[PDB]
Amino acid sequence: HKSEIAHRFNDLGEKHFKGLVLVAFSQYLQQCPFEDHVKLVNEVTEFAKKCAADESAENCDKSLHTLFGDKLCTVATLRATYGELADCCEKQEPERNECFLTHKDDHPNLPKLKPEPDAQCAAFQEDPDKFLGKYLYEVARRHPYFYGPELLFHAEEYKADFTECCPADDKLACLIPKLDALKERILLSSAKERLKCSSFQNFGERAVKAWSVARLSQKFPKADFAEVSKIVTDLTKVHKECCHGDLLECADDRADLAKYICEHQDSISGKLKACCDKPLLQKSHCIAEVKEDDLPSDLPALAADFAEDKEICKHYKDAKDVFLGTFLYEYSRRHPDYSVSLLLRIAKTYEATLEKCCAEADPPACYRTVFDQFTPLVEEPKSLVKKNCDLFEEVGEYDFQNALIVRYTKKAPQVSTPTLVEIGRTLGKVGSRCCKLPESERLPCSENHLALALNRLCVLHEKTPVSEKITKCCTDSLAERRPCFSALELDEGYVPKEFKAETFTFHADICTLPEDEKQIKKQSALAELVKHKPKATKEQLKTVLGNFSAFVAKCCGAEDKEACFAEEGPKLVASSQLALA
Ligand SMILES: CCc1cccc2c3c([nH]c12)[C@@](CC)(CC(=O)O)OCC3
Numbered sequence: 183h184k185s186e187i188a189h190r191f192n193d194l195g196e197k198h199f200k201g202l203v204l205v206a207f208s209q210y211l212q213q214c215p216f217e218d219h220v221k222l223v224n225e226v227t228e229f230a231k232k233c234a235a236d237e238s239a240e241n242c243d244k245s246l247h248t249l250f251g252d253k254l255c256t257v258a259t260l261r262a263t264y265g266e267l268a269d270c271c272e273k274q275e276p277e278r279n280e281c282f283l284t285h286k287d288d289h290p291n292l293p294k295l296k297p298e299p300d301a302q303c304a305a306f307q308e309d310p311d312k313f314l315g316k317y318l319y320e321v322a323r324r325h326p327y328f329y330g331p332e333l334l335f336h337a338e339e340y341k342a343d344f345t346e347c348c349p350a351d352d353k354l355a356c357l358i359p360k361l362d363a364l365k366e367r368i369l370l371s372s373a374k375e376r377l378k379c380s381s382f383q384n385f386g387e388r389a390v391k392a393w394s395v396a397r398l399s400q401k402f403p404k405a406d407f408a409e410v411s412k413i414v415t416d417l418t419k420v421h422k423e424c425c426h427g428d429l430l431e432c433a434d435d436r437a438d439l440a441k442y443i444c445e446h447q448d449s450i451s452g453k454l455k456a457c458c459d460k461p462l463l464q465k466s467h468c469i470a471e472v473k474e475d476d477l478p479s480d481l482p483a484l485a486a487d488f489a490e491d492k493e494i495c496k497h498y499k500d501a502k503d504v505f506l507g508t509f510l511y512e513y514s515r516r517h518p519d520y521s522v523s524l525l526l527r528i529a530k531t532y533e534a535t536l537e538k539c540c541a542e543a544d545p546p547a548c549y550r551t552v553f554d555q556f557t558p559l560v561e562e563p564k565s566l567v568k569k570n571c572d573l574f575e576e577v578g579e580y581d582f583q584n585a586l587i588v589r590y591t592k593k594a595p596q597v598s599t600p601t602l603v604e605i606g607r608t609l610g611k612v613g614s615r616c617c618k619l620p621e622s623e624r625l626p627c628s629e630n631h632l633a634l635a636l637n638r639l640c641v642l643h644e645k646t647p648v649s650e651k652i653t654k655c656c657t658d659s660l661a662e663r664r665p666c667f668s669a670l671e672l673d674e675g676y677v678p679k680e681f682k683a684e685t686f687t688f689h690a691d692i693c694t695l696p697e698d699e700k701q702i703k704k705q706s707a708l709a710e711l712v713k714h715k716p717k718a719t720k721e722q723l724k725t726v727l728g729n730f731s732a733f734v735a736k737c738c739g740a741e742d743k744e745a746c747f748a749e750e751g752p753k754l755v756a757s758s759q760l761a762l763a
Pocket residue numbers: 295296297298320321324361362364365366368369
């Protein structure tokens with residue numbers, strides 16, 4: 183286009199344009215205040231309007247990365263606050279943008295955002311545009327790979343909560359359960375999209391395509407191969423652009439894809455009808471989270487073409503990607519009861535069987551039993567989901583999380599206590615989400631969400647690497663991640679952590695904390711116990727943590743809380759060392 187910025191301005195409209203630009207700037211430089219960003223946004227928008235008037239004007243010819251990057255480099259106190267990004271500003275495009283992306287920050291470690299119901303309603307009423315603008319800023323700078331359009335969607339849910347609850351009788355009780363519900367949903371979108379960006383970064387575009395072929399085929403089993411090809415291609419392009427900070431390009435293609443899917447919903451899925459009767463952002467989001475379609479009656483038998491056919495080696499050798507693509511498509515349609523990564527593991531085994539069999543003297547007799555190689559791949563995760571859900575049903579979320587914190591601290595004791603506690607808690611929430619579902623949905627839910635949690639762990643590991651075992655699981659294979667982490671056991675080389683009694687010391691401040699924040703503190707001690715006594719059994723550790731919980735309960739219920747913690751605390755810390763031998 184003659185002017186790219188004018189094009190995107192005209193298409194998306196001013197409101198979305200300004201939103202997406204705000205988000206973009208908030209993601210790249212997370213430390214600058216909100217009012218500085220507002221000024222950058224306004225300056226870029228004014229330029230787009232000026233360009234939209236006369237597209238042949240000076241500088242309107244420039245690309246989006248040129249104009250956006252130029253703008254980023256004008257920021258006050260750039261070299262001081264972001265030395266790393268200021269190094270990029272000397273470079274030209276496309277080198278500069280690639281430098282910007284390289285030096286983004288997954289753990290900015292900003293202050294936690296408390297929902298302050300009284301004061302936020304006041305700020306909402308006085309200036310809603312500023313208030314909702316601030317929400318975009320605050321979420322974007324804490325989640326640097328969030329997809330712009332999807333954040334704009336969740337901003338409308340946020341606004342809708344504050345219109346409903348601020349005029350109402352009780353401000354907190356209306357708003358708090360809605361805001362925590364919106365948090366959960368926002369965190370899930372973020373986790374999914376970060377996995378897609380992580381898949382590009384670590385494994386490449388081919389990996390994103392294959393994941394997407396598997397998932398879309400499951401969701402849209404009645405869509406023909408060429409239809410799924412079209413959608414995955416466009417979707418992969420959306421992902422690539424949103425992950426590489428091309429937010430205006432991302433919003434446009436994402437909107438076109440939603441439009442396309444809804445134009446052709448009769449040849450894609452019958453579950454899209456309600457999603458397609460919605461406004462722009464609502465529609466895109468609904469499609470992305472649409473339930474799987476019912477299995478077609480006429481799904482083909484696969485043994486003939488993929489196991490029994492006599493010229494598979496020739497067909498495979500002619501074009502591997504097309505042949506395996508076709509296999510993955512067909513096998514994924516008929517298996518909505520498998521996880522995405524299981525399907526990719528099965529495809530990898532299919533490939534491996536043909537690589538082996540087609541080198542042997544009589545290939546067809548070798549590859550005749552190829553589908554039977556899948557049996558042990560299917561039963562391994564089916565057992566672990568049944569085992570863990572049985573455990574979760576028996577003991578509940580808190581004890582299940584503790585079981586996993588012990589499990590993972592033994593695997594990787596070099597990881598920081600906060601990270602181990604975070605990952606064990608997140609992994610435990612998969613039990614509460616998935617084990618309650620119908621049993622045919624348990625496996626996919628579980629493994630699909632474990633992947634999100636493990637990718638979080640892997641991203642944290644890129645920042646602060648501590649363990650070669652984690653690096654191998656994170657970097658070797660996307661499909662093998664969850665099995666790789668499961669296969670890890672206690673490393674027999676790890677030196678048990680130096681005993682500091684201060685680590686296991688509690689005080690009366692714990693008593694006034696919320697129940698979640700109490701658990702976290704106990705769970706942190708649990709991790710530290712494992713670090714000091716790595717060979718202690720899970721039953722020993724559970725028993726000792728029970729003694730910690732009882733101690734905290736009695737002293738928080740005492741007349742003189744601090745005298746109780748001081749007297750009873752050292753006794754418990756000393757005896758607990760002996761109980762963990
Ligand atoms: C005002 C409090 C609030 C309300 C609603 C949603 C959220 C989300 C968050 N806080 C919310 C956070 C931070 C911005 C939570 C986090 O990252 O821990 O990440 C987005 C969803």
